[PDB]
Design a protein around this ligand. Sequence first.
Ligand code: HEM
Length: 145
Amino acid sequence: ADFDAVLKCWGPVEADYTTIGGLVLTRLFKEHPETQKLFPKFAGIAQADIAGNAAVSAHGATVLKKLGELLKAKGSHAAILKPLANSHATKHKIPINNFKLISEVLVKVMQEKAGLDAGGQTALRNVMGIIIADLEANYKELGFS
Ligand code: HEM
């Protein structure tokens, strides 16, 4: 049910993955500046320059498309989630806590831009908690605690 609650507000997100994607990453980098340094292509870009950066927004669209494709799965997502754990642990080298940070940003962006109400905020936290716990379990299988 929590997946359905999120999907009932996904329309504004999917309508403009570039704009919403850029909002998410801009906010992430502003509020959690250590996360910017985990993107070598973006690390060192002055904060004031991020909101207008088309490459940042394009990457944010990639992220949100993948999250959309994890929703329109409603829990049965191992063929999507295992590769994401693999690349984020072994290629991008992203500590697990950073997924919690981007999830908090997404909740706020959806509250502001997508009509996600109090119950929907809780639903999204629940869904992101499922996703993050699966990433973490996969990280452990790879040797990353
Ligand atoms: C649930 C949230 C996230 C999703 C859905 C997601 C999704 C993606 C996807 C689909 C890609 C491209 C394919 C791949 O490399 O695996 C990617 C790349 C990447 N992600 Fe994530 N990601 C998430 C969170 C994060 C976080 C929190 C960080 C760092 C703080 C991060 C850092 C990266 C980096 C550095 C790349 C490579 C960018 C490039 O070289 O072009 N990701 N992510």
